């Protein structure tokens, strides 16, 4: 829920070029100048493009920006491993009386080839079992690239309630991974004869089972 409209996610091949678009109105992009900010996986974003088409010194000519009417565009040629980050389009709005930005566009420059998530889930603990607080743990690791849609198959049906799942993030070996916890009462686990964690990436499904 931002002001400017950017595309949520783009991906492409190393060595290729990508364009990120920014959609606005008269009040923002219409009459005022636009800027582009590269925020990395973590840490403070930096100025990439300013005044539509200007690069700060040290920002290479592989990048450029363009703008016409109520939309602007960021171009990146010679796409490289380091480039994958969240990209923000920023301009000035005269009607809102505020500096405004796009939602942000996440980049996943394909550095390596696809990897399968070999999911390993654990059930209620003996302690938790008698402690009247069963927390189903289904941890996903060593997969590439991007976030994996996670779900909890429950008693021959779906289940979305009391469920949290972390963001995909790569480790030392650059394997992006996340974790999901299903919180039930002991009774919720007793009557229901079956339970499963349903995990999906770019391609295919791999789900485990607990009873």
């Amino acid at each position: 829920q931002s002001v400017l409209t950017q595309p949520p996610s783009v991906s492409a091949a190393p060595g290729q070029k990508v364009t990120i678009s920014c959609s606005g109105s008269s009040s923002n992009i219409g009459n005022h100048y636009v800027s582009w900010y590269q925020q990395l996986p973590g840490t403070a974003p930096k100025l990439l493009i300013y005044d539509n088409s200007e690069r700060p010194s040290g920002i290479p000519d592989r990048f450029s920006g363009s703008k016409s009417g109520t939309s602007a565009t960021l171009g990146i040629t010679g796409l490289q491993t380091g480039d994958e980050a969240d990209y923000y389009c920023g301009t000035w709005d005269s009607s809102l009386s505020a500096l405004v930005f796009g939602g942000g566009t996440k980049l996943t420059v394909l550095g390596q080839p696809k990897a399968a998530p070999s999911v390993t889930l654990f059930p209620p603990s003996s302690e938790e079992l008698q402690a009247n607080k069963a927390t189903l743990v289904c941890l996903i690791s060593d997969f590439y690239p991007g976030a994996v849609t996670v779900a909890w198959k429950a008693d021959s049906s779906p289940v979305k309630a009391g469920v949290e799942t972390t963001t995909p993030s790569k480790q030392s070996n650059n394997k992006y991974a996340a974790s999901s916890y299903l919180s039930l009462t002991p009774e919720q686990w007793k009557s229901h004869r079956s339970y499963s964690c349903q995990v999906t990436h770019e391609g295919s499904t791999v789900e485990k089972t607990v009873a």
């Binding site: 005022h32 000035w92 005269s94 009386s97 500096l99």
Partner: protein, 317 residues
Amino acid sequence: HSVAVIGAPFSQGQKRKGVEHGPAAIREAGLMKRLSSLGCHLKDFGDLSFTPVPKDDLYNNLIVNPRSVGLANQELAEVVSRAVSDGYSCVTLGGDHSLAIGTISGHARHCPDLCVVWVDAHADINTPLTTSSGNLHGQPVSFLLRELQDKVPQLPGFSWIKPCISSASIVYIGLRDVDPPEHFILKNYDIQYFSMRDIDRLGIQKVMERTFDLLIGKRQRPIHLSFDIDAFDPTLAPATGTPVVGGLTYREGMYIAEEIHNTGLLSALDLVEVNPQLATSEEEAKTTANLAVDVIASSFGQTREGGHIVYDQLPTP
């Protein structure tokens, strides 16, 4: 002579605005009556653009007011050039000191061999890179110096200004507050100035005698008197911007203006930073305004010992 009166209500955003009433306050202090009484032809050109300070928010501070100011100065310089070509001496009521850009520019267009006398506590001589974001009120001189040009940036609205004056053709009087770079600039570019110390150490009389030996020493030239109101001790001038204590005595500023008149070569005058919003009371406002009127009037002949107003003989009973 002939005298042209130009209202220029300039500003540097909210918390610093109110100076726009500056010209109106001087007017309301009977400026016209007094210059009339001196026996000088008075064409008043009213107030200038007075762009209603757009939406008073936003990036207007960042670009809208500065762009509008730069252009407002362009308009002023045109009016001044027109007034000066028509043979008038130019009185410019302010307004912030930034109007000095336009006035010295417009003056220079018909009087390219003009010199400047800068009466102000400050030197108002920063580069735009040195701006305090509340920008241009105290760095106007830079654009006009034809030796600081290679170190000053082309800004939005200021494309038109070409460097009018050399460093050896402006002389400052009244210096009490100066930022480090300005001091550097003045020493570096060899610009002549007389501060309160020089005033105390030499006496007001010798300051004007040196000032005239510098500027009009070997060649008669038109003089541009830019008078900042803060130059006077804050006890005298309490309704100004960034006023500094240890300022000129009432009699010293009259003495300057009087001396300037006697040279005969006064071609234009600026009276600036006369913010009445700054005053705590009506009296503080009017006393500053009234001081302004005096300074202008003294520059155009008003002698205190009695006016030059002709009297052939006295009545018979």
